Design a protein around this ligand. Structure first.
Ligand SMILES: O=C(O)c1ccc2c(c1)N(CC1CCC1)C[C@@]1(CCc3cc(Cl)ccc31)CO2
Length: 151
């Protein structure tokens, strides 16, 4: 089975949902749980900071996307490919991809479209893993993510 994909989706899904609801999911993690738990803590620390440091730009892009429904949510894939995939890859940019995804998740809750949060997480994971697998594998995947941001 595609383990990198499965793990990425669990991490991204949990962060997005936690960010939108303000509550942690206490379900145990799936495979590679230890690493996934550390990746989630890393994301809470660096992801939350990113949304604040670039809050104005984040509010500007959200406005531009003018999300009101599911079709609008489905159009986000093309934008992520255009902006994230078409550029030099580094951990900072992957954190921005996921951090803005969480910013959108919060927005989805505000307009009562929470059911779109998991599909959004799946869209983000598709872009990340399916367009940057070689890079991720070379940087040791999520174990590398955790080491890179280690305090
Ligand atoms: O400049 C960078 O290094 C950078 C790196 C990655 C990025 C972006 C910028 N994005 C644009 C910025 C401007 C304020 C957010 C967000 C985006 C594009 C739409 C989108 C929709 C969703 Cl659901 C998630 C992530 C993204 C693609 O991920």
């Amino acid at each position: 089975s595609d383990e990198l994909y499965r793990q990425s989706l669990e991490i991204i899904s949990r962060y997005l949902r936690e960010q939108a609801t303000g509550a942690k999911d206490t379900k145990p993690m799936g495979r590679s749980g230890a690493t996934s738990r550390k990746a989630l803590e890393t994301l809470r620390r660096v992801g939350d900071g990113v949304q604040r440091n670039h809050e104005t730009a984040f509010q500007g892009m959200l406005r531009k996307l003018d999300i009101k429904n599911e079709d609008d949510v489905k159009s986000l894939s093309r934008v992520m490919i255009h902006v994230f995939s078409d550029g030099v890859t580094n951990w900072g940019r992957i954190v921005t991809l996921i951090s803005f995804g969480a910013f959108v998740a919060k927005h989805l809750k505000t307009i009562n479209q929470e059911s779109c949060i998991e599909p959004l997480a799946e869209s983000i994971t598709d872009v990340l893993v399916r367009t940057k697998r070689d890079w991720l594998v070379k940087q040791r995947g999520w174990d590398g993510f955790v080491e890179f941001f280690h305090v």
